[PDB]
Write an enzyme that holds these catalytic residues in place. Structure first.
Site, PDB file in Angstrom:
ATOM      1  N   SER A  92      -2.234 -56.661 -88.560  1.00  0.00           N
ATOM      2  CA  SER A  92      -3.417 -55.876 -88.043  1.00  0.00           C
ATOM      3  C   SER A  92      -3.630 -55.047 -89.130  1.00  0.00           C
ATOM      4  O   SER A  92      -2.764 -54.401 -89.771  1.00  0.00           O
ATOM      5  CB  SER A  92      -2.987 -55.032 -86.943  1.00  0.00           C
ATOM      6  OG  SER A  92      -1.918 -54.203 -86.965  1.00  0.00           O
ATOM      7  N   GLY A 125       2.100 -58.093 -87.418  1.00  0.00           N
ATOM      8  CA  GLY A 125       2.189 -57.081 -88.527  1.00  0.00           C
ATOM      9  C   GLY A 125       1.227 -57.306 -89.536  1.00  0.00           C
ATOM     10  O   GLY A 125       1.254 -56.611 -90.495  1.00  0.00           O
ATOM     11  N   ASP A 168     -10.141 -49.494 -81.950  1.00  0.00           N
ATOM     12  CA  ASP A 168      -8.868 -49.509 -82.417  1.00  0.00           C
ATOM     13  C   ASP A 168      -8.797 -49.168 -84.132  1.00  0.00           C
ATOM     14  O   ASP A 168      -8.209 -50.049 -84.994  1.00  0.00           O
ATOM     15  CB  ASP A 168      -8.328 -50.800 -82.284  1.00  0.00           C
ATOM     16  CG  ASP A 168      -7.011 -50.822 -82.398  1.00  0.00           C
ATOM     17  OD1 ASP A 168      -6.063 -49.711 -82.639  1.00  0.00           O
ATOM     18  OD2 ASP A 168      -6.240 -52.070 -82.550  1.00  0.00           O
ATOM     19  N   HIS A 217      -3.657 -48.712 -83.113  1.00  0.00           N
ATOM     20  CA  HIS A 217      -2.569 -49.155 -82.451  1.00  0.00           C
ATOM     21  C   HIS A 217      -1.198 -49.106 -83.255  1.00  0.00           C
ATOM     22  O   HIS A 217      -0.043 -49.260 -83.014  1.00  0.00           O
ATOM     23  CB  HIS A 217      -2.685 -50.457 -81.613  1.00  0.00           C
ATOM     24  CG  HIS A 217      -2.740 -51.586 -82.594  1.00  0.00           C
ATOM     25  ND1 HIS A 217      -3.689 -52.301 -82.902  1.00  0.00           N
ATOM     26  CD2 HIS A 217      -1.529 -52.393 -82.742  1.00  0.00           C
ATOM     27  CE1 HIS A 217      -3.505 -53.447 -83.380  1.00  0.00           C
ATOM     28  NE2 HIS A 217      -2.198 -53.485 -83.568  1.00  0.00           N
TER      29      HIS A 217
HETATM   30  C1  LIG Z   1      -0.226 -60.984 -83.743  1.00  0.00           C
HETATM   31  C2  LIG Z   1      -0.730 -60.018 -84.518  1.00  0.00           C
HETATM   32  C3  LIG Z   1      -1.840 -59.283 -83.890  1.00  0.00           C
HETATM   33  C4  LIG Z   1      -2.933 -58.560 -84.960  1.00  0.00           C
HETATM   34  C5  LIG Z   1      -1.902 -57.708 -84.123  1.00  0.00           C
HETATM   35  N1  LIG Z   1      -2.474 -56.765 -83.131  1.00  0.00           N
HETATM   36  C6  LIG Z   1      -1.955 -56.582 -81.647  1.00  0.00           C
HETATM   37  O1  LIG Z   1      -0.811 -57.113 -81.563  1.00  0.00           O
HETATM   38  C7  LIG Z   1      -2.922 -55.945 -80.842  1.00  0.00           C
HETATM   39  C8  LIG Z   1      -2.444 -54.746 -80.440  1.00  0.00           C
HETATM   40  C9  LIG Z   1      -3.139 -54.802 -79.010  1.00  0.00           C
HETATM   41  O2  LIG Z   1      -4.563 -54.777 -78.932  1.00  0.00           O
HETATM   42  C10 LIG Z   1      -5.270 -53.444 -78.839  1.00  0.00           C
HETATM   43  N2  LIG Z   1      -4.494 -52.437 -78.816  1.00  0.00           N
HETATM   44  C11 LIG Z   1      -5.336 -51.098 -78.979  1.00  0.00           C
HETATM   45  C12 LIG Z   1      -4.149 -49.727 -78.663  1.00  0.00           C
HETATM   46  C13 LIG Z   1      -5.178 -48.654 -78.725  1.00  0.00           C
HETATM   47  O3  LIG Z   1      -4.651 -47.012 -78.691  1.00  0.00           O
HETATM   48  C14 LIG Z   1      -3.051 -47.503 -78.446  1.00  0.00           C
HETATM   49  C15 LIG Z   1      -6.673 -48.546 -78.967  1.00  0.00           C
HETATM   50  C16 LIG Z   1      -7.452 -49.655 -79.029  1.00  0.00           C
HETATM   51  C17 LIG Z   1      -6.817 -50.796 -79.115  1.00  0.00           C
HETATM   52  N3  LIG Z   1      -7.339 -52.301 -79.027  1.00  0.00           N
HETATM   53  C18 LIG Z   1      -6.561 -53.552 -79.243  1.00  0.00           C
HETATM   54 CL1  LIG Z   1      -7.421 -54.981 -79.375  1.00  0.00          CL
HETATM   55  C19 LIG Z   1      -2.590 -56.067 -78.543  1.00  0.00           C
HETATM   56  N4  LIG Z   1      -2.709 -56.739 -79.591  1.00  0.00           N
HETATM   57  C20 LIG Z   1      -3.062 -58.402 -79.565  1.00  0.00           C
HETATM   58  O4  LIG Z   1      -3.135 -58.845 -80.761  1.00  0.00           O
HETATM   59  C21 LIG Z   1      -2.586 -58.893 -78.338  1.00  0.00           C
HETATM   60  N5  LIG Z   1      -3.860 -59.853 -78.213  1.00  0.00           N
HETATM   61  C22 LIG Z   1      -5.016 -59.195 -77.420  1.00  0.00           C
HETATM   62  O5  LIG Z   1      -5.064 -57.967 -76.623  1.00  0.00           O
HETATM   63  O6  LIG Z   1      -6.271 -60.036 -77.440  1.00  0.00           O
HETATM   64  C23 LIG Z   1      -7.259 -59.569 -76.486  1.00  0.00           C
HETATM   65  C24 LIG Z   1      -7.884 -58.580 -77.118  1.00  0.00           C
HETATM   66  C25 LIG Z   1      -9.068 -59.094 -78.230  1.00  0.00           C
HETATM   67  C26 LIG Z   1      -8.770 -60.845 -77.776  1.00  0.00           C
HETATM   68  C27 LIG Z   1      -8.326 -60.837 -76.663  1.00  0.00           C
HETATM   69  C28 LIG Z   1      -1.477 -59.780 -78.501  1.00  0.00           C
HETATM   70  C29 LIG Z   1      -0.416 -59.068 -78.708  1.00  0.00           C
HETATM   71  C30 LIG Z   1      -1.636 -61.216 -79.397  1.00  0.00           C
HETATM   72  C31 LIG Z   1      -1.261 -60.568 -76.745  1.00  0.00           C
HETATM   73  C32 LIG Z   1      -0.781 -57.210 -84.899  1.00  0.00           C
HETATM   74  O7  LIG Z   1      -0.358 -57.715 -85.829  1.00  0.00           O
HETATM   75  N6  LIG Z   1      -0.122 -55.923 -84.341  1.00  0.00           N
HETATM   76  S1  LIG Z   1       0.886 -55.319 -85.466  1.00  0.00           S
HETATM   77  O8  LIG Z   1       0.606 -55.058 -86.769  1.00  0.00           O
HETATM   78  O9  LIG Z   1       2.135 -56.404 -85.289  1.00  0.00           O
HETATM   79  C33 LIG Z   1       1.438 -53.663 -84.748  1.00  0.00           C
HETATM   80  C34 LIG Z   1       1.816 -53.771 -83.114  1.00  0.00           C
HETATM   81  C35 LIG Z   1       2.222 -52.638 -85.647  1.00  0.00           C
HETATM   82  C36 LIG Z   1       0.926 -52.485 -85.232  1.00  0.00           C
END
Ligand SMILES: C=C[C@@H]1C[C@]1(NC(=O)[C@@H]1C[C@@H](Oc2nc3cc(OC)ccc3nc2Cl)CN1C(=O)[C@@H](NC(=O)OCCCCC)C(C)(C)C)C(=O)NS(=O)(=O)C1(C)CC1
Ligand SMILES: [Zn+2]
Length: 200
Positions: free
Chosen positions: A159, A157, A101, A77
């Site tokens: 992940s 930020g 992911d 992601h």
């Molecule tokens: C706050 C920091 C966290 C680490 C972080 N991660 C994210 O925000 C990930 C991306 C997406 O999740 C995913 N997207 C996917 C997308 C794909 O193809 C597009 C394929 C597989 C995927 N599998 C996942 Cl799980 C949503 N989410 C979450 O965390 C959400 N919670 C959640 O959904 O919880 C349930 C799931 C488990 C427990 C429930 C939130 C936003 C908190 C509500 C972070 O820092 N990201 S980032 O660096 O800022 C960034 C955005 C710059 C990169």
């Protein structure tokens, strides 16, 4: 429908690292925003790489990437299918798994790799993009609870960063926050065993 003017997505670019080599964890920037933008377009990055945890960026996002077993791993992601910038031009992912992911590239020259954990231990530590070290109790194959919950802003930020065992082995890759009313009480992570399966 006009192929000659179709644009190309840029590369992921290493813009810094989380320094864990000494007694103090701290973030270092190695490339600024303009130089990042240029390097993403060319895919050519001559900067020296060091350490296990990199700060990486695209044009639109910034997150982390972690070297384990000679592969630089991060989240789909964040990176999508993008190449990574390297001294000799863009490098194609050698692993891509949207179902987990998860993506990976050959680890850059000069990086160091974490060792996969074989301790079977549930006292973990999450490393953030701000070099905060967050105690986490493992609660399942892919979940851990924060001993001290934090707003999700604190984790945004990060992940692609590591969860480590007490000995500094890699236990997983931070994937998503488990959030209630904007407070992260737990984290979801890609277990290192899943990386190892992907490698086979
Ligand atoms: C706050 C920091 C966290 C680490 C972080 N991660 C994210 O925000 C990930 C991306 C997406 O999740 C995913 N997207 C996917 C997308 C794909 O193809 C597009 C394929 C597989 C995927 N599998 C996942 Cl799980 C949503 N989410 C979450 O965390 C959400 N919670 C959640 O959904 O919880 C349930 C799931 C488990 C427990 C429930 C939130 C936003 C908190 C509500 C972070 O820092 N990201 S980032 O660096 O800022 C960034 C955005 C710059 C990169
Ligand atoms: Zn261990």
């Amino acid at each position: 429908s006009h192929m000659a003017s179709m644009k190309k997505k840029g590369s992921v670019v290493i813009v810094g690292r989380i320094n864990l080599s000494g007694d103090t964890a701290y973030a270092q920037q190695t490339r600024g925003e303009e130089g990042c933008q240029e390097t993403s377009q060319t895919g050519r990055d001559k900067n020296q790489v060091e350490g296990e945890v990199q700060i990486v960026s695209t044009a639109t996002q910034t997150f982390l990437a972690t070297s384990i077993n000679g592969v630089l791993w991060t989240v789909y992601h964040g990176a999508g299918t993008r190449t990574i910038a390297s001294p000799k031009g863009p490098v194609t992912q050698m692993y891509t798994n949207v179902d987990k992911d998860l993506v990976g590239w050959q680890a850059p020259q000069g990086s160091r790799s974490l060792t996969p954990c074989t301790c079977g231990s549930s006292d973990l530590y999450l490393v953030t993009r701000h070099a905060d070290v967050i105690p986490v109790r493992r609660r399942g194959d892919s979940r851990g609870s924060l001993l001290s919950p934090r707003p999700i802003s604190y984790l945004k930020g990060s992940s692609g960063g590591p969860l480590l065992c007490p000995a500094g082995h890699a236990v997983g890759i931070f994937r998503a926050a488990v959030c209630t009313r904007g407070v992260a009480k737990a984290v979801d992570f890609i277990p290192v065993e899943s990386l190892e399966t992907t490698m086979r």
